[PDB]
Ligand binder design. Structure first.
Ligand SMILES: Nc1ncnc2c1nc(Cl)n2[C@@H]1O[C@H](CO)[C@@H](O)[C@H]1O
Length: 385
């Protein structure tokens, strides 16, 4: 029953996803708000602790006590220059507890501090409860994914997050490996298969090259930009609309925090529409000083606004190919991961770079990692019996 069941969890920097392999198919499980992905956010309020959508929805009102980006801290020392650099951009407090970072917040009127693995365990507990509500029984066995470049300390702290969350961690697997499993790229018989995973998420960009020799995976190269993702494209749209509002009304909205946030969420939505329509409309009632902001933008203008950012995704692709000592024609498969890979210009740039090649994109890119993890969790729990 529950002991013969296992889930696959993609514990992402900005969003998390949970899947279950049953009756010959993967089911990506929708949360209680009907969403197939859940924000990796934890909010501490005057009455409760919020996780996911409810935590993301109140981030504007409670920025000091809304934790996100715990994956950027997990398994790291406080003195790490990555931690020191990132801390300058977060609205929550990061403290030092014997060279280990802790996030410090106000919860129910009291000062509390949490290890990154305790924050990630609250995200994992939520994914576990989402699976349990779908299945009708508690599931405890899980496969949890991590980036291919995570070292032993980051992998161990992720497994610790799983234990705190009440999960039996069957295995910690690499995100590009789970994505290759989702597409069945390890079941092509004999002979070495070279796979490139192009993973463009909400806040990070990763390129991974894997060799699959008779079911055995080997990471040949990892490249990317830890500070490039979908949110940079939302911000390019924000700057455009701030300049358009200034041209139409001769008023600068940039300093009004509420106006900028409402414009930001509307921009994120319009950006998503631009992946399937050639135009999107913004409909903001009383954006600033009682002025409605009803406008539109073409996909052509959006592509111009992010042109340099889209083109920059090809430098880590070339870098990974040189590190792996492989030419483009030596790559057998191209896999898309992350919601931002739905952007048509991004697909066109990657396809043209690989000389007109087909892309593996039939599985929802923001769900491919959880899909593969769910497949692996089923194989692993079956072998355990
Ligand atoms: N249809 C889409 N077109 C463009 N961007 C998208 C789309 N869906 C998501 Cl999610 N994202 C973005 O992916 C990230 C999460 O993986 C977020 O930045 C989200 O906006």
């Amino acid at each position: 029953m529950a002991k013969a069941a296992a889930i696959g969890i993609d514990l992402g920097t900005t969003y998390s996803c949970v899947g279950v392999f049953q009756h010959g198919k993967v089911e990506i499980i929708a949360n209680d708000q009907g969403n197939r992905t859940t924000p990796s956010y934890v909010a501490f309020t005057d009455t409760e602790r919020l996780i996911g959508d409810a935590a993301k929805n109140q981030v504007a009102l409670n920025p000091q006590n809304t934790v996100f980006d715990a994956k950027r801290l997990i398994g790291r020392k406080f003195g790490d220059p990555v931690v020191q650099s990132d801390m300058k951009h977060w609205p929550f407090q990061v403290i030092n507890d014997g060279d280990k970072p802790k996030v410090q917040v106000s919860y129910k009127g009291e000062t509390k501090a949490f290890y990154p693995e305790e924050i990630s365990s609250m995200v994992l507990t939520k994914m576990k409860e989402i699976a349990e509500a779908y299945l009708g029984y508690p599931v405890t066995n899980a496969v949890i994914t991590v980036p291919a470049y995570f070292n032993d300390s980051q992998r161990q702290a992720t497994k610790d997050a799983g234990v705190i969350a009440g999960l039996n961690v069957l295995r910690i697997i690499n995100e590009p490996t789970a994505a290759a499993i989702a597409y069945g790229l390890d079941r092509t018989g004999k002979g070495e298969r070279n796979v490139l995973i192009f993973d463009l998420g909400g806040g990070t960009f990763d390129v991974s090259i894997l060799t699959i020799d008779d079911g055995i995976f080997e990471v040949k190269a990892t490249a990317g930009d830890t500070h490039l993702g979908g949110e940079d494209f939302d911000n390019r749209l924000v700057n455009h609309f701030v300049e358009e509002f200034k041209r139409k009304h001769k008023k600068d909205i940039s300093q009004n925090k509420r106006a900028v946030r409402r414009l930001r969420t509307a921009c994120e939505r319009a950006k998503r529409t631009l992946s399937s329509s050639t135009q999107a409309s913004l409909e903001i009632d009383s954006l600033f000083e009682g002025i409605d902001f009803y406008t539109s933008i073409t996909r052509a203008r959006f592509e111009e606004l992010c042109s340099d950012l889209f083109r920059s995704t090809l430098e880590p692709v070339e870098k990974a190919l040189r590190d792996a000592k492989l030419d483009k024609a030596q790559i057998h498969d191209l896999v898309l991961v992350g919601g931002s890979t739905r952007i048509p210009k991004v697909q066109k740039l990657l396809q043209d770079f690989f000389n007109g090649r087909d892309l593996n994109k039939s599985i929802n890119p923001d769900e491919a990692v959880a899909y593969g993890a769910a497949v692996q969790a089923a194989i692993l729990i079956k072998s355990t019996r």
